[PDB]
RNA sequence: GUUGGAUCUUGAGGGCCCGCCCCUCGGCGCCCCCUCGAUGUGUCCCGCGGGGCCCGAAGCGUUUACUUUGAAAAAAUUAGAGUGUUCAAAGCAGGCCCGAGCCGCCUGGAUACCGCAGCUAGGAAUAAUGGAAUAGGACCGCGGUUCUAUUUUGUUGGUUUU
RNA sequence: GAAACUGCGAAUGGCUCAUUAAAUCAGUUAUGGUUCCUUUGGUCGCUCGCUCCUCUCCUACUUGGAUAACUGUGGUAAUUCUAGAGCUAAUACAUGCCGACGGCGCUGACUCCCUUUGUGUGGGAUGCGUGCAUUUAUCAGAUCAAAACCAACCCGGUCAGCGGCGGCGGCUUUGGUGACUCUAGAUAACCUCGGGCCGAUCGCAGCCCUCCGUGGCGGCGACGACCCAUUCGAACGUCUGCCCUAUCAACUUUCGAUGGUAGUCGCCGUGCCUACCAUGGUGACCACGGGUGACGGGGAAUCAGGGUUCGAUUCCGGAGAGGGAGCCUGAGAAACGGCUACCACAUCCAAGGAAGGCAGCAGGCGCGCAAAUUACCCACUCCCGACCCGGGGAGGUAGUGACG
C-alpha cells in the first residue's frame, strides 16, 4: 500500500531487515522488505490489507506492536473527517428505576482507524477493541469494519 | 496524602472469615508479607491464642514464639503474625500435634488435626510453569515456591506433592476431569466436590462447572477452584460442619441436639 | 586479623559454595535420566502418527 | 517540578480541567541530556523506583553493526549529516536516536578482506599499497584450494557497500537513545534506506 | 425530541410431563488409526477413545432490549438465625461433666441485601431488527484459463501435474 | 556496658474536610505500558583457562587509609550553633587474592590416507572469542495432502554407480498466551570509568591429620550482595453513575485545541514535551461557561407502597497540614513534631544575627447558639526497632458529659 518514503524517514518492522549478502545490489526490497502480519485472536482474522500493506502506521494490531486486551465495543461511525481517525457514537442504555421508563444516552469517542481498513465511509457499523492509550483521546482501535444488513445495497442486479 | 503503604490494619475492617470480634479491640493482628495474600491469610496469633487459647496477653504470644517450638511447613518460624494460608501445616514439636488449615463450608478456618504422615507433604496447585533463564524449567506453586527441574510432562492446574522435609517435587497428580477440588472464596466457600466440566472462554475469565457430593450443581471461576488431589481419593480428611454444604435448618438441628448432651 | 575463627569461616564459605555446585550437577543428571527414559515411551508416538497420515490420505 | 500529568490541559469538549492534587516527586521529568560530539563522559543517575539510568554528556564512539555480515565493531562517529526529527539537531551536532552519522569504512573493510581472504576491489591508492595485496597473496601455502572452494562469489560484496567504501565513510543510523542508554549504537545503512537518506540529504541542501 | 396499523408453522409413558412436527463436542452413519465382537502396525457391525466429513440434535437463519440462572459481589451497619448481657440498650458469646488426676466432653459467631454497567446462561412472547426486483442464495452440481502455498516420489534443486 | 559509628523506622501513626463537578470517588476492568525495600521460595567457587596474566597478576594464614565517640584547647549577646589540635574501629569507606589438573569455535604453520595433485575422508599446534547483566545487530523461534523424470549424494535388495553413485524405494528431529518481533537458542561484539555483578563479615559449637599447626570439612544463625518469582503496594488506562443554572447557546490552539509521523523526556503508556505535517475535537441526548457550608462511598432519618431528606463526623478511598514554589534522603515523601526560598503571620536580639508552624494530644485566645482534663499509663489492644525485654497524647484508663 502507501509508501513510507512519503514522510522524511524510512521505517522497518522489527526483525525484518536487509541482508543483501554476497550477491550484488539489493535488498532494496520489491515490497519494501517482507511484510509481516500476525493475528490478534478473539474471533478476528487478519485481512488482505495487512499483507498488502507496507504503511507507516504501527497502531494496527495486525502489523504493529500494540496489543488488544479488554472490552470489545461496537459503535456507528458518526464522523469521518481527517486521516487515520474516525469518531464513533456509542449508544448505551442508562437504567432509571425511579421513573418506570429509562433513557438512552450516548457519548462520542474518537478512535483510531488503521489503513488496514479502506473502502470505509460514514454510517458504517464498526467493531472496536480496547488497547493501551495510543494518543490523548484515543484509547481504542478499529479491529473490524463490518457490513451488515439494515444498511442495504444488497438488493442488486450487477 | 498517603505517602506510602500502611503498616497497620484496624479491626472491624479485617476479613470476616478470620473470626475476630467487633469493636472490643481497635486493631487486628494483620498478616506479615509472605507467600500468600493478606485477605486469605490467618495470622499465627489468631490460631494460637483465639482458637487454641495458649495466651491471654500479647506479651505471652511473643514469648511463645521465641521458644521456637513451632515450625510452619517443616521450617522454623518465630514470626508473631505469620501469614499461613490454605493447606499450610503448623507443627507443634513440643506435643507432636500437626494442624492444617482448610475451610469449613460454614466459612470458618478449621482446627483440623492430621497425622504426622499427612503432615510430611501438602498438595499445591501450580500457578505458573515457567521456562526460566538459560532454558532451565521451573514450576511455581500458589504459595510462591519455585522448584527447579520439575517433571517433564506437567501442564497447568496440576497438583504437586511438595515435601517439607527435603523440599522439591515428590511425584505429582495430573489434572483431569472429575478431580477433587475445594472451591474457596465467594458464595461457594469451603464446598468440596468433583469437576464435571470446565468451560473455556477465549479472553479473560473461564468458569468451571462443579458438582458437589450432595448433587448441588454450580459454577465458579477457575481462579476460585483449587485442586486438592485426584477424584474420589482424598489425601486429607473432611473438616467439621461437613465441609460439603449444609442448610441453615439442618445446621440449627445439629446445634441444639449436640448442646446439653456432652459432658 | 587472621585467627582460627576467621580460617574456619573462610572454610565454611568455600564449603557451602562447593556443596552448591555439586547439588546443581546431581539434579541436572537425575533430570536427564528421567527425560531420556520418557522418550522411549512418549516420543516414539510420532512414528505412529506420521505413518497413519498416509493410510488416511489413500482414500 | 518539571511536569508530566494528564490532569491538566484542555478537554475534548473544549473545557478545561482543574487540578488533582499538588505536584509530586513521581511527576519529575528531568531536563535533556543534550549529548553532542566530543570526548566521552557518562554519569550514573539515581532515578525513581531505584535503578540507575545513564546520562551521557558528550559521546564520540558507538558500536556500529554491519547487519548483512552479522558483525559489530566499535568505531568513531565524527558528525551528523542528516536527522529527520529536526534539521537544527544536525546543525548543532546533537546526537539523538535516528541520527544519520558517519563512521569509518576501514574496520569493516579490513574485517571482510581478512576474513574472506579476497579483496572487494580497490578502495583507494593509499589503502592498496602496503596491504590488501598481502591478503590477495594469502598466507595459506597450502589451504589455498580450501579458500577457493569455501568462498564462491567473493572477491566482491554488494554494490551499495562498495560505493560507501570509496567515500571513506559509511552512513549509519543510530538505533538507541544516546541520552538515556548512554550508547550511540546503531546499524550500517544499506539498500533502499541508504538511497532514501541520500535523496533527503540532497533535497534539503541547496 | 417523543410516539406509532395489521401480517411469517412446534404421536406415545404414566396419571400435566418430555424431544418434535404441516463438528471444538455428542453422535444416525460414511471413510481412518490402537482396533470392539467375525480378528488380536490390523476388518467388513463402529467412531463407542483420539480423528475428519456429516444428520434427528445443534452455531443452524439477522441482531437485541427484556426476562431467567450463575459468578464477581467490604467488615461494621441493617433485616435477621443461634446464644439466659438478672430484663434491656447491647455483646458474640457459651453449656456440661469430673472431689480438684474427667489431667475432661462439646455447640457456635447463620443466612439475606447490592446504584449501575460488564461478565455467564435458559427462554423467544412482547418492542424494535434481518433479506431475492432489470437476481440471489443454497448442494464437492461442473468446465476451460491463470495463480500461489506446502505435504509427498530418501535428502536437496529443476521441470509437470494433482 | 553509658556513649558513638553502622543499619532500620521516621512516607507509617494521628488530625481535619478547606480544595476539587466526570475532577475526587464508587463499582467493574487493565498494565502484553511499568516500578517496587522487605518477607516467603529458588538463584551463591571460575576468569567457563585472554587456546591460564588468575602455576608468573606471588596479599589469601586477608590489602589501603580516615572520622566520630574520646582526650585537650576553644569561639559565639543569643542556636538541637559549631572551629581547631592529638587519637582511632568496622557488616562504614576504596580495593584486590588463593582457583579448570578433564572450557569453546572458526580463520590456520598444516600433517595422514584413498581416486596423482585436481576432487574427497580425516585431525590440528601457533592466535583471538568461551559466567551473567547491560547495549546493538542478524539469524532462530521448524509445525498442512500425493506422483513421473532429470542434476547433485545417504543407506538397503540387485547392478546399466562398479552403495566413490546412475537406474527402484526408505526413516524425515522445538516451550507459552485468546493474542507480542513472547520465552529460549545460535553467531559477532559492545561497556559502566570514582560511575554492572560474581562475600577481604561475624557469632555459636562439633572434626581429621602417612603428623603436630598446618591445610583441608560438618551443623546451627547473623548480615550483606546479584537475579527471578512473591507480598504490601504504586502511577496511569476501560466501562457506568453525581448538585443547581439558558437573565450561561456555541465552544477549544497561537503560549496544542484534536490527529498523523519522528524524537527529546519520564518508574513506564500518552501532545508528556518538540519539530514537521494535517484541520481536527465537542454541543439542544445541555456541551461550553457560571455557582456551590460540592470531599466521595459503605452507610443514616422519615415514608402504607411509591418516595423525600441526610452523609466533616468510630470504617474504607482520595486530599491537605499558615499560603505558594523548589528540593534532599530513601524501594516509597515534593514530608512542616525534614529542608530551602519567597509571601502573609509570629518570636528572640547585646542590633551583628538567630531560630518557628497544634486542620497531633491536652490547654489558651479569638469566634459564636454551640462542644470536656494544662490528669494517669504502656498493663490491655496493636505498631515500630538491632528487639520477649525498649518507645508510643497510636491506643488504654479515669475526669468532664440530662447529645441521646
CSV table of N, CA, C and O in Angstrom, one decimal, chain A residues 68-157:
chain,number,residue,atom,x,y,z
A,68,UNK,N,-4.1,-5.8,22.0
A,68,UNK,CA,-5.5,-5.6,22.2
A,68,UNK,C,-5.9,-6.5,23.3
A,68,UNK,O,-5.8,-7.7,23.2
A,69,UNK,N,-6.3,-5.9,24.5
A,69,UNK,CA,-6.8,-6.6,25.6
A,69,UNK,C,-7.9,-5.8,26.2
A,69,UNK,O,-7.8,-4.5,26.2
A,70,UNK,N,-8.9,-6.4,26.7
A,70,UNK,CA,-10.0,-5.8,27.5
A,70,UNK,C,-11.3,-5.9,26.7
A,70,UNK,O,-11.5,-6.9,26.0
A,71,UNK,N,-12.2,-4.9,26.9
A,71,UNK,CA,-13.5,-4.8,26.4
A,71,UNK,C,-13.5,-4.6,24.9
A,71,UNK,O,-12.7,-3.9,24.3
A,72,UNK,N,-14.5,-5.2,24.2
A,72,UNK,CA,-14.7,-5.1,22.8
A,72,UNK,C,-16.1,-4.4,22.7
A,72,UNK,O,-17.0,-4.9,23.3
A,73,UNK,N,-16.2,-3.3,22.0
A,73,UNK,CA,-17.3,-2.5,21.9
A,73,UNK,C,-17.7,-2.3,20.5
A,73,UNK,O,-16.9,-2.7,19.6
A,74,UNK,N,-18.9,-1.8,20.2
A,74,UNK,CA,-19.3,-1.6,18.8
A,74,UNK,C,-19.9,-0.2,18.8
A,74,UNK,O,-20.4,0.3,19.9
A,75,UNK,N,-19.9,0.5,17.7
A,75,UNK,CA,-20.4,1.8,17.5
A,75,UNK,C,-20.7,2.0,16.1
A,75,UNK,O,-20.3,1.2,15.2
A,76,UNK,N,-21.3,3.1,15.7
A,76,UNK,CA,-21.7,3.6,14.4
A,76,UNK,C,-20.8,4.8,14.1
A,76,UNK,O,-20.7,5.6,15.0
A,77,UNK,N,-20.3,4.9,12.9
A,77,UNK,CA,-19.4,6.0,12.6
A,77,UNK,C,-20.3,7.2,12.4
A,77,UNK,O,-21.2,7.2,11.5
A,78,UNK,N,-20.2,8.2,13.3
A,78,UNK,CA,-20.9,9.4,13.2
A,78,UNK,C,-20.1,10.4,12.4
A,78,UNK,O,-20.7,11.2,11.6
A,79,UNK,N,-18.7,10.4,12.4
A,79,UNK,CA,-18.0,11.3,11.6
A,79,UNK,C,-16.8,10.6,11.1
A,79,UNK,O,-16.1,9.8,11.9
A,80,UNK,N,-16.4,10.9,9.9
A,80,UNK,CA,-15.1,10.6,9.3
A,80,UNK,C,-14.8,12.0,8.9
A,80,UNK,O,-15.6,12.7,8.3
A,81,UNK,N,-13.6,12.5,9.3
A,81,UNK,CA,-13.1,13.7,8.8
A,81,UNK,C,-11.7,13.5,8.3
A,81,UNK,O,-11.5,13.0,7.2
A,82,UNK,N,-10.7,13.8,9.1
A,82,UNK,CA,-9.3,13.7,8.7
A,82,UNK,C,-8.8,12.3,8.9
A,82,UNK,O,-9.4,11.4,9.4
A,83,UNK,N,-7.6,12.1,8.2
A,83,UNK,CA,-6.9,10.8,8.2
A,83,UNK,C,-6.5,10.2,9.5
A,83,UNK,O,-6.2,10.8,10.4
A,84,UNK,N,-6.6,8.8,9.4
A,84,UNK,CA,-6.3,7.9,10.5
A,84,UNK,C,-7.0,8.0,11.8
A,84,UNK,O,-6.6,7.4,12.8
A,85,UNK,N,-8.2,8.7,11.8
A,85,UNK,CA,-9.0,8.7,13.0
A,85,UNK,C,-10.4,8.8,12.5
A,85,UNK,O,-10.7,9.5,11.4
A,86,UNK,N,-11.4,8.3,13.2
A,86,UNK,CA,-12.8,8.4,13.0
A,86,UNK,C,-13.4,8.7,14.3
A,86,UNK,O,-12.7,8.5,15.4
A,87,UNK,N,-14.7,9.2,14.4
A,87,UNK,CA,-15.4,9.3,15.6
A,87,UNK,C,-16.6,8.4,15.5
A,87,UNK,O,-17.3,8.4,14.4
A,88,UNK,N,-16.8,7.6,16.5
A,88,UNK,CA,-17.9,6.7,16.6
A,88,UNK,C,-18.8,7.2,17.7
A,88,UNK,O,-18.3,7.7,18.7
A,89,UNK,N,-20.1,7.0,17.6
A,89,UNK,CA,-21.1,7.4,18.6
A,89,UNK,C,-21.5,6.1,19.2
A,89,UNK,O,-22.0,5.2,18.4
A,90,UNK,N,-21.4,5.9,20.5
A,90,UNK,CA,-21.6,4.7,21.2
A,90,UNK,C,-22.9,4.9,22.0
A,90,UNK,O,-22.9,5.7,22.9
A,91,UNK,N,-24.0,4.2,21.6
A,91,UNK,CA,-25.3,4.3,22.2
A,91,UNK,C,-25.3,3.2,23.3
A,91,UNK,O,-24.7,2.1,23.1
A,92,UNK,N,-25.9,3.6,24.4
A,92,UNK,CA,-26.0,2.7,25.6
A,92,UNK,C,-27.2,3.1,26.3
A,92,UNK,O,-27.8,4.2,26.1
A,93,UNK,N,-27.7,2.2,27.2
A,93,UNK,CA,-28.9,2.4,27.9
A,93,UNK,C,-28.4,2.8,29.3
A,93,UNK,O,-27.6,2.0,29.9
A,94,UNK,N,-29.0,3.8,29.9
A,94,UNK,CA,-28.8,4.2,31.3
A,94,UNK,C,-30.1,3.8,31.9
A,94,UNK,O,-31.1,4.2,31.5
A,95,UNK,N,-30.0,3.1,33.0
A,95,UNK,CA,-31.2,2.5,33.7
A,95,UNK,C,-31.6,3.4,34.8
A,95,UNK,O,-30.8,3.9,35.6
A,96,UNK,N,-32.9,3.7,34.8
A,96,UNK,CA,-33.6,4.5,35.7
A,96,UNK,C,-34.6,3.6,36.3
A,96,UNK,O,-35.3,2.9,35.5
A,97,UNK,N,-34.6,3.5,37.6
A,97,UNK,CA,-35.7,2.7,38.3
A,97,UNK,C,-36.7,3.6,38.9
A,97,UNK,O,-37.9,3.2,39.1
A,98,UNK,N,-36.4,4.9,39.0
A,98,UNK,CA,-37.1,5.8,39.9
A,98,UNK,C,-38.4,6.3,39.1
A,98,UNK,O,-39.5,6.3,39.6
A,99,UNK,N,-38.2,6.6,37.8
A,99,UNK,CA,-39.2,6.6,36.8
A,99,UNK,C,-39.2,5.3,36.2
A,99,UNK,O,-38.2,4.6,36.2
A,100,UNK,N,-40.4,4.8,35.8
A,100,UNK,CA,-40.6,3.4,35.4
A,100,UNK,C,-40.4,3.2,33.9
A,100,UNK,O,-40.9,2.2,33.4
A,101,UNK,N,-39.8,4.2,33.3
A,101,UNK,CA,-39.2,4.0,32.0
A,101,UNK,C,-37.8,4.6,32.2
A,101,UNK,O,-37.4,5.2,33.2
A,102,UNK,N,-36.9,4.3,31.2
A,102,UNK,CA,-35.5,4.6,31.3
A,102,UNK,C,-35.0,5.2,30.0
A,102,UNK,O,-35.8,5.1,29.0
A,103,UNK,N,-33.9,5.9,30.0
A,103,UNK,CA,-33.5,6.8,28.9
A,103,UNK,C,-32.2,6.3,28.3
A,103,UNK,O,-31.2,6.1,28.9
A,104,UNK,N,-32.2,6.3,26.9
A,104,UNK,CA,-31.0,6.2,26.1
A,104,UNK,C,-30.0,7.4,26.4
A,104,UNK,O,-30.5,8.5,26.6
A,105,UNK,N,-28.7,7.1,26.3
A,105,UNK,CA,-27.7,8.1,26.4
A,105,UNK,C,-26.6,7.7,25.5
A,105,UNK,O,-26.5,6.5,25.1
A,106,UNK,N,-25.7,8.6,25.1
A,106,UNK,CA,-24.7,8.3,24.2
A,106,UNK,C,-23.5,9.2,24.6
A,106,UNK,O,-23.6,10.1,25.4
A,107,UNK,N,-22.4,8.8,23.9
A,107,UNK,CA,-21.1,9.5,24.0
A,107,UNK,C,-20.5,9.4,22.7
A,107,UNK,O,-20.7,8.4,22.0
A,108,UNK,N,-19.7,10.4,22.3
A,108,UNK,CA,-18.9,10.3,21.1
A,108,UNK,C,-17.5,10.0,21.6
A,108,UNK,O,-17.1,10.5,22.6
A,109,UNK,N,-16.8,9.2,20.8
A,109,UNK,CA,-15.4,8.7,21.2
A,109,UNK,C,-14.6,8.7,19.9
A,109,UNK,O,-14.9,8.1,19.0
A,110,UNK,N,-13.5,9.5,20.0
A,110,UNK,CA,-12.5,9.5,18.9
A,110,UNK,C,-11.7,8.2,19.0
A,110,UNK,O,-11.4,7.7,20.1
A,111,UNK,N,-11.5,7.5,17.9
A,111,UNK,CA,-11.0,6.2,17.8
A,111,UNK,C,-10.1,6.1,16.6
A,111,UNK,O,-10.5,6.7,15.5
A,112,UNK,N,-8.9,5.5,16.7
A,112,UNK,CA,-8.0,5.4,15.6
A,112,UNK,C,-8.6,4.4,14.5
A,112,UNK,O,-9.2,3.4,14.9
A,113,UNK,N,-8.3,4.7,13.3
A,113,UNK,CA,-8.8,4.0,12.1
A,113,UNK,C,-7.5,3.7,11.4
A,113,UNK,O,-6.8,4.6,11.0
A,114,UNK,N,-7.2,2.4,11.2
A,114,UNK,CA,-5.9,2.0,10.6
A,114,UNK,C,-6.1,2.0,9.1
A,114,UNK,O,-7.2,2.0,8.6
A,115,UNK,N,-5.0,2.0,8.4
A,115,UNK,CA,-5.0,2.0,6.9
A,115,UNK,C,-5.1,0.5,6.5
A,115,UNK,O,-4.9,0.2,5.3
A,116,UNK,N,-5.4,-0.4,7.4
A,116,UNK,CA,-5.7,-1.8,7.3
A,116,UNK,C,-7.2,-1.9,7.0
A,116,UNK,O,-7.7,-3.0,6.9
A,117,UNK,N,-7.9,-0.8,7.0
A,117,UNK,CA,-9.3,-0.7,6.7
A,117,UNK,C,-9.4,0.5,5.7
A,117,UNK,O,-9.0,1.6,6.0
A,118,UNK,N,-9.9,0.2,4.5
A,118,UNK,CA,-10.1,1.1,3.5
A,118,UNK,C,-11.3,0.6,2.7
A,118,UNK,O,-11.6,-0.5,2.8
A,119,UNK,N,-11.8,1.5,1.9
A,119,UNK,CA,-13.2,1.5,1.4
A,119,UNK,C,-14.2,1.5,2.5
A,119,UNK,O,-15.0,0.5,2.7
A,120,UNK,N,-14.1,2.5,3.4
A,120,UNK,CA,-14.9,2.7,4.5
A,120,UNK,C,-15.6,4.1,4.3
A,120,UNK,O,-15.1,4.9,3.5
A,121,UNK,N,-16.7,4.3,5.1
A,121,UNK,CA,-17.5,5.5,4.9
A,121,UNK,C,-18.3,5.7,6.2
A,121,UNK,O,-18.2,4.9,7.1
A,122,UNK,N,-19.0,6.9,6.3
A,122,UNK,CA,-19.7,7.3,7.5
A,122,UNK,C,-21.0,6.5,7.4
A,122,UNK,O,-21.6,6.3,6.3
A,123,UNK,N,-21.6,6.1,8.6
A,123,UNK,CA,-22.8,5.3,8.7
A,123,UNK,C,-22.5,3.9,8.9
A,123,UNK,O,-23.3,3.1,9.3
A,124,UNK,N,-21.2,3.5,8.7
A,124,UNK,CA,-20.7,2.1,8.8
A,124,UNK,C,-20.7,1.7,10.2
A,124,UNK,O,-20.4,2.5,11.1
A,125,UNK,N,-21.1,0.4,10.5
A,125,UNK,CA,-21.1,-0.2,11.8
A,125,UNK,C,-19.7,-0.7,11.9
A,125,UNK,O,-19.1,-1.2,11.0
A,126,UNK,N,-19.0,-0.5,13.1
A,126,UNK,CA,-17.7,-0.8,13.3
A,126,UNK,C,-17.5,-1.4,14.7
A,126,UNK,O,-18.3,-1.1,15.6
A,127,UNK,N,-16.6,-2.4,14.8
A,127,UNK,CA,-16.3,-3.1,16.0
A,127,UNK,C,-14.9,-2.7,16.4
A,127,UNK,O,-13.9,-2.9,15.7
A,128,UNK,N,-14.7,-2.1,17.6
A,128,UNK,CA,-13.5,-1.5,18.1
A,128,UNK,C,-13.1,-2.4,19.3
A,128,UNK,O,-14.0,-3.0,19.9
A,129,UNK,N,-11.8,-2.3,19.7
A,129,UNK,CA,-11.4,-3.1,20.8
A,129,UNK,C,-10.5,-2.3,21.6
A,129,UNK,O,-9.7,-1.4,21.1
A,130,UNK,N,-10.4,-2.5,23.0
A,130,UNK,CA,-9.7,-1.8,23.9
A,130,UNK,C,-8.2,-2.0,23.7
A,130,UNK,O,-7.8,-3.0,23.2
A,131,UNK,N,-7.4,-1.0,24.2
A,131,UNK,CA,-6.0,-1.0,23.9
A,131,UNK,C,-5.4,-0.1,24.9
A,131,UNK,O,-6.2,0.6,25.6
A,132,UNK,N,-4.1,0.0,25.0
A,132,UNK,CA,-3.4,1.0,25.8
A,132,UNK,C,-3.6,2.3,25.2
A,132,UNK,O,-3.7,2.3,23.9
A,133,UNK,N,-3.6,3.5,25.8
A,133,UNK,CA,-3.8,4.8,25.2
A,133,UNK,C,-2.8,5.1,24.2
A,133,UNK,O,-1.6,5.1,24.5
A,134,UNK,N,-3.3,5.2,22.9
A,134,UNK,CA,-2.5,5.4,21.7
A,134,UNK,C,-2.1,6.9,21.6
A,134,UNK,O,-1.0,7.2,21.2
A,135,UNK,N,-3.1,7.7,21.9
A,135,UNK,CA,-2.9,9.2,21.9
A,135,UNK,C,-4.0,9.6,22.9
A,135,UNK,O,-4.7,8.8,23.5
A,136,UNK,N,-3.9,10.9,23.2
A,136,UNK,CA,-4.6,11.5,24.4
A,136,UNK,C,-6.1,11.2,24.5
A,136,UNK,O,-6.5,10.8,25.6
A,137,UNK,N,-6.8,11.3,23.4
A,137,UNK,CA,-8.2,10.9,23.4
A,137,UNK,C,-8.4,9.5,23.1
A,137,UNK,O,-9.2,8.8,23.7
A,138,UNK,N,-7.6,8.9,22.2
A,138,UNK,CA,-7.8,7.6,21.6
A,138,UNK,C,-7.3,6.5,22.5
A,138,UNK,O,-6.1,6.4,22.6
A,139,UNK,N,-8.2,5.8,23.1
A,139,UNK,CA,-7.8,4.6,23.8
A,139,UNK,C,-8.0,3.3,23.0
A,139,UNK,O,-7.7,2.2,23.5
A,140,UNK,N,-8.7,3.4,21.8
A,140,UNK,CA,-9.2,2.2,21.1
A,140,UNK,C,-8.8,2.2,19.7
A,140,UNK,O,-8.2,3.2,19.2
A,141,UNK,N,-9.0,1.1,19.0
A,141,UNK,CA,-8.5,0.9,17.7
A,141,UNK,C,-9.5,0.0,17.0
A,141,UNK,O,-10.0,-1.0,17.6
A,142,UNK,N,-9.8,0.3,15.7
A,142,UNK,CA,-10.8,-0.4,14.9
A,142,UNK,C,-10.2,-1.8,14.6
A,142,UNK,O,-9.1,-1.9,14.0
A,143,UNK,N,-10.8,-2.9,15.0
A,143,UNK,CA,-10.4,-4.2,14.8
A,143,UNK,C,-11.1,-4.8,13.5
A,143,UNK,O,-10.5,-5.6,12.8
A,144,UNK,N,-12.4,-4.4,13.3
A,144,UNK,CA,-13.1,-4.9,12.1
A,144,UNK,C,-14.1,-3.9,11.7
A,144,UNK,O,-14.8,-3.4,12.6
A,145,UNK,N,-14.2,-3.5,10.4
A,145,UNK,CA,-15.3,-2.7,9.9
A,145,UNK,C,-16.3,-3.7,9.3
A,145,UNK,O,-15.9,-4.3,8.3
A,146,UNK,N,-17.5,-3.9,9.9
A,146,UNK,CA,-18.5,-4.8,9.4
A,146,UNK,C,-19.4,-4.1,8.4
A,146,UNK,O,-19.6,-2.9,8.5
A,147,UNK,N,-19.9,-4.9,7.4
A,147,UNK,CA,-21.0,-4.6,6.6
A,147,UNK,C,-21.9,-5.8,6.8
A,147,UNK,O,-21.5,-6.9,7.1
A,148,UNK,N,-23.3,-5.6,6.6
A,148,UNK,CA,-24.2,-5.8,7.7
A,148,UNK,C,-25.5,-5.3,7.1
A,148,UNK,O,-25.6,-4.3,6.5
A,149,UNK,N,-26.6,-6.1,7.4
A,149,UNK,CA,-27.9,-5.8,6.8
A,149,UNK,C,-28.6,-4.9,7.7
A,149,UNK,O,-28.4,-4.8,8.9
A,150,UNK,N,-29.6,-4.2,7.2
A,150,UNK,CA,-30.2,-2.9,7.7
A,150,UNK,C,-29.5,-1.7,7.1
A,150,UNK,O,-29.9,-0.6,7.4
A,151,UNK,N,-28.6,-1.9,6.1
A,151,UNK,CA,-27.8,-0.9,5.6
A,151,UNK,C,-28.0,-0.9,4.1
A,151,UNK,O,-28.0,0.1,3.4
A,152,UNK,N,-28.3,-2.2,3.5
A,152,UNK,CA,-28.6,-2.5,2.2
A,152,UNK,C,-27.5,-1.9,1.2
A,152,UNK,O,-26.4,-1.6,1.6
A,153,UNK,N,-27.9,-1.7,-0.1
A,153,UNK,CA,-27.1,-2.1,-1.2
A,153,UNK,C,-26.7,-3.5,-1.3
A,153,UNK,O,-25.5,-3.9,-1.4
A,154,UNK,N,-27.8,-4.4,-1.2
A,154,UNK,CA,-27.7,-5.8,-1.1
A,154,UNK,C,-28.7,-6.4,-2.0
A,154,UNK,O,-28.6,-7.5,-2.4
A,155,UNK,N,-29.7,-5.5,-2.4
A,155,UNK,CA,-30.6,-5.8,-3.5
A,155,UNK,C,-29.9,-5.1,-4.6
A,155,UNK,O,-29.6,-3.9,-4.7
A,156,UNK,N,-29.4,-6.0,-5.6
A,156,UNK,CA,-28.6,-5.6,-6.7
A,156,UNK,C,-29.0,-6.4,-7.9
A,156,UNK,O,-29.8,-7.3,-7.8
A,157,UNK,N,-28.4,-6.1,-9.0
A,157,UNK,CA,-28.7,-6.7,-10.3
A,157,UNK,C,-27.4,-6.7,-11.1
A,157,UNK,O,-27.4,-7.0,-12.3
